[PDB]
Amino acid sequence: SMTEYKLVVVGACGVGKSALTIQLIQNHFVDEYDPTIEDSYRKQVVIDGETCLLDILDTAGQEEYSAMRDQYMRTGEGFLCVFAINNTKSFEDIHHYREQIKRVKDSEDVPMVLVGNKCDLPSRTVDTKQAQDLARSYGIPFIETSAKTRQGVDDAFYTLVREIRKH
């Protein structure tokens, strides 16, 4: 049988959670996808010779989902923690996303990948060095992405599957 992986995409409003997810699922860039929509998407992929069924939850942090947030997160096997390379606040928020994931999962060994999105844009305010130092402090990988060009997007999700395997 195919190995099934429940992945959860988190991070500040506007970092590109939806754009990243829709690239993997539908192979196109969506400009300004409805920021309020939270849904799960399924995709079959081959990673290192293993057929994987991915169930990806694209979080939107809306008030209507707030009561059930912990129940939705607890079934996640791995988390993509996304910031944008032109938004320092989204990078500062990463340690808070990790605080909440560690709380819900009651563990410091939750499979996780740090993702720096929008690497196509010129006006960078967070360097790869900063993100790699943060990832190293957590013992997790860092992957740079552009949801616009699709560069690195699959590497981010596939890296998270490899982290879930180690767990």
Ligand X SMILES: */C=C/C(=O)N1CCN(c2c(C#N)c(=O)n(-c3c(C)ccnc3C(C)C)c3nc(-c4c(N)c(F)c(F)c(F)c4F)c(Cl)cc23)CC1
Ligand Y SMILES: Nc1nc2c(ncn2[C@@H]2O[C@H](COP(=O)(O)OP(=O)(O)O)[C@@H](O)[C@H]2O)c(=O)[nH]1
- Partner that binds at residue 43, options ligand X, Cl ion, ligand Y, none, CB closer than 5 to 8 Å by kind: none
- Partner that binds at residue 46, options Cl ion, ligand X, Mg ion, none, CB closer than 5 to 8 Å by kind: none
Which string of x and - marks every residue 75-114 that binds ligand X (by CB under 6 A)?
A: ------------------x--xx--xx--x----------
- For binding to ligand Y (CB under 6 A), which residues are involved? 13-19, 31-33, 35, 117-118, 120-121, 146-148
Window 15-44: residues binding Mg ion (CB under 5 A): 17-18
Window 40-69: residues binding Cl ion (CB under 5 A): 61, 69
DSSP assignments along the chain, one per residue: -PEEEEEEEE-STTSSHHHHHHHHHHSS--TT--TT--EEEEEEEEETTEEEEEEEEE----GGGTTTHHHHHHT-SEEEEEEETT-HHHHHHHHHHHHHHHHHHT-S---EEEEEE-TT-S---S-HHHHHHHHHHHT--EEE--TTT-TTHHHHHHHHHHHHHH-
- Give the nearest distance from C-beta 10 to ligand Y in angstroms: 9
The count of other CB atoms within 10 Å of the CB of residue 71 is 9
100 binds Cl ion, rule: CB under 5 A: no
- Partner that binds at residue 31, options ligand Y, Mg ion, Cl ion, none, CB closer than 5 to 8 Å by kind: ligand Y
**Which residue in the block uniquely carries the two structure tokens 């992945």?**
7
Q: Which residues are at the interface with ligand X (CB under 6 A)? A: 10, 12-14, 35, 59-61, 69-70, 73, 93, 96-97, 100-101, 104
Task: List interacting residues with Cl ion (CB under 5 A).
Answer: 61, 69
